[PDB]
Amino acid sequence: NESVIESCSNAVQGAANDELKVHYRANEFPDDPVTHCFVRCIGLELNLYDDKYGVDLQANWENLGNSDDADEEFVAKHRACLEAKNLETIEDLCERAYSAFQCLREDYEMYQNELWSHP
Numbered sequence: 001n002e003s004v005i006e007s008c009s010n011a012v013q014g015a016a017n018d019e020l021k022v023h024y025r026a027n028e029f030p031d032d033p034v035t036h037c038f039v040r041c042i043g044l045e046l047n048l049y050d051d052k053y054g055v056d057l058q059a060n061w062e063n064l065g066n067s068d069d070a071d072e073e074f075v076a077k078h079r080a081c082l083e084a085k086n087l088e089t090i091e092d093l094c095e096r097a098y099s100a101f102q103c104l105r106e107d108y109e110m111y112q113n114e115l116w117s118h119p
């Protein structure tokens with residue numbers, strides 16, 4: 001939603017940027033340090049992500065237009081994708097969040113046309 005986007009653009013140094021905000025409202029998130037932190041900010045604010053507990057897969061399932069329990073294969077595939085990113089070894093919190101987000105990026109794109117992954 002606009003609110004969280006506006007707030008995160010202010011919370012993140014450099015993110016209050018016309019050209020980047022154009023991408024963000026268009027659901028594109030370039031692989032750059034400002035966007036990394038912006039993506040982290042949105043994940044934290046929407047309760048989709050946590051620096052320690054990783055991705056909440058049920059919350060993302062629901063953010064993808066579902067109101068039911070996540071499909072088992074959705075959970076399994078993303079848990080595996082996320083484990084493969086070795087997030088706990090990424091020291092920079094924004095880079096870690098962006099890397100975790102990359103596991104869900106396609107789901108969000110297909111949609112656009114708690115199940116913490118690290119309990």
Ligand SMILES: O=Cc1ccccc1
Nearest residue numbers: 039040043049097101
């Ligand atoms: O901030 C990281 C993140 C991860 C998964 C979904 C949304 C955001």
Ligand SMILES: [N+]
Nearest residue numbers: 006009010016
């Ligand atoms: N902004």
Ligand SMILES: [N+]
Nearest residue numbers: 037038040041
């Ligand atoms: N952030």
Ligand SMILES: [N+]
Nearest residue numbers: 044045046047
């Ligand atoms: N949060």
Ligand SMILES: [N+]
Nearest residue numbers: 047048056059
């Ligand atoms: N959540």
Ligand SMILES: [N+]
Nearest residue numbers: 066067068069
């Ligand atoms: N539900």
Ligand SMILES: [N+]
Nearest residue numbers: 067068069070
């Ligand atoms: N549910």
Ligand SMILES: [N+]
Nearest residue numbers: 067068069070
């Ligand atoms: N359930």
Ligand SMILES: [N+]
Nearest residue numbers: 070071072073
């Ligand atoms: N399932």
Ligand SMILES: [N+]
Nearest residue numbers: 082083086087
């Ligand atoms: N991981």
